[PDB]
Amino acid sequence: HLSKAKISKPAPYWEGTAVIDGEFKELKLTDYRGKYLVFFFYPLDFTFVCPTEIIAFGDRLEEFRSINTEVVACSVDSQFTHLAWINTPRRQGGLGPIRIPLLSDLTHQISKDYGVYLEDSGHTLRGLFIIDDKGILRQITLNDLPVGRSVDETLRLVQAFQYTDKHGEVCPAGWKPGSETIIPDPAGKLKYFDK
Amino acid sequence: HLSKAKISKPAPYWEGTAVIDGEFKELKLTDYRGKYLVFFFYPLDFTFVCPTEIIAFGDRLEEFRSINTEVVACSVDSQFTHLAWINTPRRQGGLGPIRIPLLSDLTHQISKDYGVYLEDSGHTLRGLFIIDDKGILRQITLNDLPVGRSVDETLRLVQAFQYTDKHGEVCPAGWKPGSETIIPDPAGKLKYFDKLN
Amino acid sequence: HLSKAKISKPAPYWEGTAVIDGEFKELKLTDYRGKYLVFFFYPLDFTFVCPTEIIAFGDRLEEFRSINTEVVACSVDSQFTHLAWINTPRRQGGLGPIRIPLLSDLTHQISKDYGVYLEDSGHTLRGLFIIDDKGILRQITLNDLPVGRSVDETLRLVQAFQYTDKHGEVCPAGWKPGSETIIPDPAGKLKYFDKLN
Amino acid sequence: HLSKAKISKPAPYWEGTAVIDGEFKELKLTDYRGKYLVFFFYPLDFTFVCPTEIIAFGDRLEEFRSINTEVVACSVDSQFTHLAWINTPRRQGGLGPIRIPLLSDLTHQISKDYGVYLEDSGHTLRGLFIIDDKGILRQITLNDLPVGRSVDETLRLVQAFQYTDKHGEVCPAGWKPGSETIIPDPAGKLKYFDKLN
Amino acid sequence: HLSKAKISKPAPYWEGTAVIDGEFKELKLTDYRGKYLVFFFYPLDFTFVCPTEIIAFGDRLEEFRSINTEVVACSVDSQFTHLAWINTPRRQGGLGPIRIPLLSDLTHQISKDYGVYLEDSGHTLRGLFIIDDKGILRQITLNDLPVGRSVDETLRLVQAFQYTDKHGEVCPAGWKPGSETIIPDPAGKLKYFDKL
Amino acid sequence: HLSKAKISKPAPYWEGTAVIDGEFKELKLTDYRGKYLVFFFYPLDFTFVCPTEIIAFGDRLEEFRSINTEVVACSVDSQFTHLAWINTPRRQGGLGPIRIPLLSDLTHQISKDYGVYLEDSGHTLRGLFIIDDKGILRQITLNDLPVGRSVDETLRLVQAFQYTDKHGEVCPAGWKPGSETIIPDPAGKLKYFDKL
Amino acid sequence: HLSKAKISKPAPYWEGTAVIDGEFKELKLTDYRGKYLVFFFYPLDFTFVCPTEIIAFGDRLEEFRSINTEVVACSVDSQFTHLAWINTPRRQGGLGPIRIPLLSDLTHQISKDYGVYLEDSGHTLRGLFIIDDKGILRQITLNDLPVGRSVDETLRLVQAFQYTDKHGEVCPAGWKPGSETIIPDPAGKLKYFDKLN
Amino acid sequence: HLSKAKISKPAPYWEGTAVIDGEFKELKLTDYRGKYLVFFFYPLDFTFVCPTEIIAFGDRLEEFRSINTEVVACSVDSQFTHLAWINTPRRQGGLGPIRIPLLSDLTHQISKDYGVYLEDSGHTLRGLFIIDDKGILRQITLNDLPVGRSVDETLRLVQAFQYTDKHGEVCPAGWKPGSETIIPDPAGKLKYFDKLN
Amino acid sequence: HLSKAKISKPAPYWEGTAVIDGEFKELKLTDYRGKYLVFFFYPLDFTFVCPTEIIAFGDRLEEFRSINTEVVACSVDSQFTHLAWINTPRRQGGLGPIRIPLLSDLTHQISKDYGVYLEDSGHTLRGLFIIDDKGILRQITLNDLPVGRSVDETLRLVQAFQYTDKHGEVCPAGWKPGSETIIPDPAGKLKYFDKLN
C-alpha cells in the first residue's frame, strides 16, 4: 500500500470520525473545499512533542483563519482517546479544550494514503500537508519523531502559496509577505535579479 | 521506480558528477559521513526560485559549517550547464561563484531514488533532505515549484536534530536554541508540562 | 492476513510493549510457558464494556494465580493510552491501578494473528483465548462488541482443561470441580453413563 | 477451504438432512429466521462429552424456547448413525429420544464453512454459534475435545444479546438479566461508572 | 484430488484406526504384504446393503483364509460408530461379532485415494479391490449404491489371480478352479481351442 | 488425459466404427438409449482370454436381450482386424460368426475416456461397464490381463440394477432374482433382518 | 507430441516387439548399426495397398541384402495381428510367410516420433525412411493412403546415398548406378556441365 | 516456427515473387486450384544437383501439363539471382531458358511453412510436394542434399493419385498406368489378391 | 523502452518545447509534413562538437530551405538552458542567434523513441535522421560522441532522396546532382552499366 500523496495532484481523499468541540463528528477532506487546509499527522495522544504541536497551532488558529485557512490534526488513536486527551489538563501533557478537529485513523488507511504510516511502530511520523482551496496538494513536510514542526514556517508557506496563486509571480528563498517576488520569464526575471 | 527515501532509515546512496569550485568532481553521499548533510534538489538551472535558494544557502554557508553541517544542491541539468550557470552574473539570474557543490543528475537516477522526480516535466520539484552524521534521513521537505524554501527553518531543524541527538530530550513545536525541551517519559514529561502552565 | 489461531496447535507467537505496574515492559507469549494463560483482546481504551471486563478479571486475579494461571489483556491502543486509562479513576470509566498487563497492538499484527481484528473498525472484537502451560491453544471465545465476557465461565474452563490434562477423564457439559467425569473409552464410559441413570 | 463464519455478518448458510422427531427431514439455516438459534457442532456420535452436551441442551430446551430461541446440533456423522444413537439408552451412552434436531454433515461442507473441522481427525471440535433472529452471527465459542460446554453460559449469552438488541445499552462483564447495563456514550457512560464506584 | 488406484501397480498405501475384535487397532496396508487382500469400501454403518455384504464376507471368511487371503472392510464412519454397530444385534441391522476388521476413513483420504468417495454424498460407493501378496492391485469392482456385491464372484477372482500367478497360464471367461486354462502362446493356445 | 467414467453419472459418450454382422457400421453410445448396455473392452484381437469372453457373451447373448440389455465389445484393433478375427474359425482362436458388435478404438480416445487404456501396453485392460437405459453408468468391473470376466456375474448385476430401478428396494450381497430384498428405511429394514 | 525425424540427424531411436521368422522378438533401431536400413510404416494389417508393399519389399529382399541394406516394416497393429496376417494366404489378402520383420507400435510412440501418425484415423500413413549405416536419417518419403510406394525408387535412393557416402561426388536428378555424377565445387562442377551440354 | 505441411490437409498457403518467362510476377498457391501441382524446393542457385533437377523437370514439363499438372520450383535465393541463373548457359551450370516458375523465398517463410528450411545452413533441403487440384497435400518427398530426385517417380505418383481420385480403386506397390488395382473393401479386394495368386 | 525509428516506416511522432527565435514554442513532428525534415540530436548544451554542428547547419540553412527542407535540433537540455546557450557569444562556445529550432527532451521520451538515448550518460549520442515530406524515415546517421557530422553529406543525401522520389531511378554510390542514375530493372539497368564501362 503506497503513498497516494503527490505534490500538484489532488490530495488523497479522506473521511473519518473526529472530535470537534468535544463531540464526535464525521469529517471529510472535501468539507474543506474553497479554503486552504493545513492537514497534519502526529504520532500519538498522551505523548510529548505531539501536544505541543497541536496546542501551538490551536492557540494561533486565527492567523490561519484570517487568511481563509483551516487546520486539521490526525493520529491513529481512536476518538475516545482523543476526547480523553482533550479532557486532560495541559499541565499534565493533555490538550485541554481545543479549537482544531482531531481526526481518528484507527484503520491506518488515511495514514497509508498519505504515506506517513510507520509499519514498525503502528503509528504515524510527523507529517504535515498543505492543501490549497482547489484541493491540490502543494507542500509536504515530514519530520522524524523527536523534532516538532513550526507554525511560523507553516504560515509563511500558506502565505506564499496564496500569493503565487493570486499574482502568478514566484517566491524566492525565505519569502515573507512584503518581500520581492520574481516574474517567471527568461526576460521578466531580470527585474528581480538586476537590482 | 519507487522512492527509497524513508525517514529513520539510511538516506538512499547516490554518487555523481558535481561542479565544486568551478571544477568537475566525483561526489558521493558517503563523503559526508561524520557530518549532518543538507541535500536538496531544485528544478532547473537558469530559472527563477532556484538560483535564490542556492544563493540563500550559499551566502549563509558558515552557519551550517560551524554546526558540522554541509550543503549539497542537485538538479537534472548537466555539469556543463551548471558551470555555465555559475559563470553567469547574479544580476542576470546566474549564481556567481558558490561554495556549494552542484550535483548533476542527468540520468535521473538520484531524483527517482529520492522520490522528487517529476515524470511529466523531466525535472524535480523542490525537495530538501536532512541527513545526519550517521547517514540516517531525518527530515523531508517537499515544495511545489512556485514556492522557495527557508534557510532559517532548515537551520532550526538541523539544530533541533543535533540537540535531540546529544540530549535525548525531544523538541517542542517551534523549538529554537535556548527553548524548553521535553523528557520523553510519562512522569519525566511533567517537568516540561507543569512548568509551562 | 489470515488467522493463525488453531485449537490444539501452538498459540500464535506474540510480543510487544505492555504496561506492567505502571511501566512499559516488553512482553512475550513465551514468558508464560509453564503456566496457563488467559489471553484476551478488548476493542478500545476509554470505552464501555471494556473497562468492566478488564476490572472483572483484575479484581479476581488471585483466583487465577492460585491455579497457576495468568491473565493478559490486549487492545490496538498505544502503551501511552493504556497508562492514561490506568491513571483514570474508575468513576470516570478508567481502570484505576491494575495487576493485569495491558499489551499494546498498534500495528495490528497480534490481533490479525489471532483472527480478532475488525478490518473496517480498526480495532478488535471481544476475543479470549485459553492457552495451556505447553503453549497450546485450548479454547477460543469470541463475542460481538456489545456483550461482555464471564470470569466464571473462564475459570470453569481453565479448571476443566487443567483437570483433563492431569487425569485423562473428560469433562461433561457443565462440569465444575467436584462433578462427575467420563473415562473416554467405549467400556469405561459406562461407569459414568450407568451411574446417572 | 476457509472459514466463512464471521461475527456481525450473516452466518454461513447451511442445509442438510437432520434427524427430527425420529425422522429424516431436510433442515436449513433459513428455517430459523425470526428466532435466535444456538447452532452447535460436536465431534462424534457414540463418544463421551458429546452425548452429555446434547442431552444437557435437550433436557433444558424450554429455557431456550421460552426466549424465542431454538437449538440445533451437528456432527460429521450420518443421519443413520444419529438415529441409531437416539435409539441407544442413555445408560449405554446413547441419547435416548431427543427434541433437538441432529444435523448431519457427511461432506464436511458445513463444518468447514463454520471453521470447526479438524483436518487431522476427520471430525469437528466443540464449536458453538449464537445466531440472531436476523441471521447475524453474534458469538463463537470453541472448545478443544476434552472439555464440554455450558448450557448456562449459553443462556446468559443469548439473554444478553437479546437485551442489547432491544435496548441498545451494552452488557458488562458477567451481566445476568437484572444486572446494570451501560449507555454506550462518553457522556451517558458515567451514569454507570459513578453508580458502581 | 484424484484416484491412485491403478491395476498392475502397487495399491495405494493406507493406514487408519480399525476395530479388531471389539478393539481399536492401527491397521496398515503393509501389514498385509505376503497375503492376498480383499479390501472393500461400503457406504454407511447402520444402513441396508452394507451389513449384508459385511456379514456375507465374515461368515465365509474361512474360504478366504484357507487360500491365504485376508479381508478388510472400510467406511467413512468413526471407529466408535463401527464398534456400536458391532454391538448391535444382527436382527436389528447390526453385525454382531465380526472377524473382519472395520477400518475407519473419517478424513476421506483413503476413499479419495481409492477413487471411491462420492463428493455429493460424503461417503463411498460399493468399491472392492483385490490386492495380491506383492501389494499389486489386480482387480477393481465398483457398484452403485443399491446393488450388493457377491462373495462367490470375489472368491472366483482371487482363485483366478492366484492360479495365473503360479502356473503362468491364463483363465478364460467363467473360470472356476478345475476349469481349462490357456497357454498364452500363438501356438500353445491351440490345445485349448481345438478341444472345443 | 483422464477417465470420465463415473458411477451414477452419464456414461461418457462414444462413437466409432464397428463390425456388425460382417459389416462396417457407425455405432454410437446414444444408439442404446432405452436399453441397458453391457459395454466392455478387451485387450487384443487374436489373443487368448479375449475370444473366450467375447464368445461366452455372444453364445448367451439371448439371456441379455430377453431382459432388454444389449452387449458391445471394444478393443484398440482396427475394424479390418476385427472382421478378419470373425472370419477365423473358433478352433484357431477366432470368433466365427458373432452377434455382438465389435467396436474399434484405434485412436484410444474411447479407452482413455473409460479409463481402461494401458499407457505402457498400447491396449486396454479387461474393463466392463453396465449402463442403464437412461444412459447412466451403474457398474464398473476391471480385471488385470490374465483373468477373464464372468457372464453369470454380469447377468446378476444387470438383473439387480433393473430390480432396484423398478421396485425401489435394494439388493443384499449375493442377490439373484427371487432373493429377499430390503426396504431402505430405518424401520422397513426390519422385515428383512428379523427374518434371519 | 512432435515429430523427431530430421534429415541429416540421427534417426529417432525405436524399440519394440516384432514378428520375425514367425516369432515375437524385441527389435531395436540400433540393431541395424553398420547397415543401411529401409524403415517403413504402413497403415493397417488386413487392408489393401499395405500387403502389396510388404510383399513387394519382401519378395525382393536380396536386392537390398546384397547392398548391405535391411528392411523393417511397422504398423500400429499388435504383434498377434501381425502373425495372424502372416498366417493368412496371399490369395485372401494375407502376407503368407515373410522374411522382413514386422514391428508393432501399439502405443503410437514410434509413429509419433517419426511424424507419420494420423491423429484422426488412429494409424499411420505410408511413410518410408532411409537410414544410413551410421544411423543418420537421409530420405523421407510420405504417401497419402491410396497410393503405394515403389521398391525401385527406394533401391535407386539407397544406391545413390551409398555412392555419395563413398565418393563424395553428388548425384543428379534421375541418377542410376553408372550415371554421371558431379564434383560439388564451383570449379570441378564444369567437368559435368561441359560434358552434358 | 513449425511445419504446417500435412498429408490429407490443405497445403500451406504461399505467395511471393517468381521469375516467369524472364519477368518478375507475383505467384500464389491458389493460382493452381483446379490443377495438380508439383511444388518443389531446391537448396541453392548456382550449385550442383539443383540445376539438374530444375532442368530435368523443365525439359519434361509437357509430360506434366498433358495430365493437368503444373510444376513450380522454389529456393531461398532472390528473384534477381534466379534470373541471373536463367541467363547463365547450361554449360556453366546455369539453367538457360526455362518454363518452370522459379519462386523466391528470401524471408524463409515458405520453406519454414513446408518444414524444409535448414536452420543452420540458411537454405532448404530437397523437398518436393504433390498437391492435388483441390489444394490438398498428397505426397511429401524429402531428400538429403547430395541426392537428386526423380521425374519418373514423380510422374508415377501424380498418375497414381489422379487415378485413385477418379476411380476409388487403390494403387498397389509399384503401380504404373496399366497395372492391377485393388478395390478397397474386405470382399472386393479378393478380386485383386486371388488374381495374382 | 525500445527504438521506434525504422527506415521506410513513419518516423516516430514527437512533440515538445523548443526555442524558436528566442521564444518557447510547442513544436510537433507533424508540423513538417509537406517538407523533408533533417531532425538531429546532439549530446549536451555548452559542450564542444555540438555547437559546431548546430552552427554548421544554421549558417547553411538556405541550402536546405531552397530544397523544401527544414532542420530541427534536439537535446535532453531544458528550453531554459537552450535559451541561455543561444544568448551566449559564439566566441565563448555559445551559439549566438540561430534560425534552427532547439527542441528540449527533458523527459528523454523523444531520445528513447529515436534509439539515441545513452542510459549510462543521461544524454544522446550524435543521431541524425532524414525524414521525407510524407513523414517517412529515410536515413539514419549515428555518430560516437567525439566526431561531428557533415552538412555536405546531409545535403547530398536529401538531394539523393528527392531525386529518386521524383524520378524512380536509383542513386549510385557517391551520387551528386548531375550524376548518372540507374533504372532499377534487370534490362533497364544496362543503360547505366554499359555506359560507364
Added chain:
Amino acid sequence: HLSKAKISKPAPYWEGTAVIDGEFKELKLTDYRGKYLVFFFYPLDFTFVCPTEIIAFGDRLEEFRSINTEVVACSVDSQFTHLAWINTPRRQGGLGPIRIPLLSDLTHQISKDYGVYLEDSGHTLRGLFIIDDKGILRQITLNDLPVGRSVDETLRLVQAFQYTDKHGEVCPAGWKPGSETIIPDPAGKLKYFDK
C-alpha cells in the same frame, strides 16, 4: 531478435563464408583486430545501387589500406551467388574481379545482430558500420534502398575517429584532415571558439 549493434560497445561478433580472391574462406570479425574496419551490408547481388557501392569502395581500397583500414561487404546472398556475381562483367551489373571480401549471411543471423535485416523483404537495407581497431563500434550509417552511400564521407569518418583516438581532441562539423579540432574542456575549448 533485436539489434546488438550499439555505438561505443564491442561490435557484435560475426563469422561466415566469404568469397575472397575468387575462393571460399571462413571469415571472422576478430580477424580484423588491430585494424579499423568498414563493415557494410548491401541488399542483393545482381541488383542496382549495390554493385556501385561495392565497386566504389573496391576501386578506392588503398585510401583505406594506407590508413590501416579494411573493408568488408555482406549480403544475405549465398557464396555461390557472390562468386557468380564476381564472374559477371561490370558492363552488365556484375562486379568483375574485386579486392574486398564478400561475406554471405544466408541465415540472416549477422544482419539481425546488426539490426539491418528487413523482415518483410528477406534482405538487408544499406547499412554501414565503422568499427575501430579495438573492435568497438563507432559509427552507424543506414540508408533506405534507393540511395547509395559515400566513400568520401566514410573516409572522412574513419580519419576523424583515428584522429580523436590518437590526440584526444574532438572533430567539429565537417572536419577533414588538417581542419581545426577542439579541446574538450570548459576552459580549453576557448582556443577553438575565440579565434
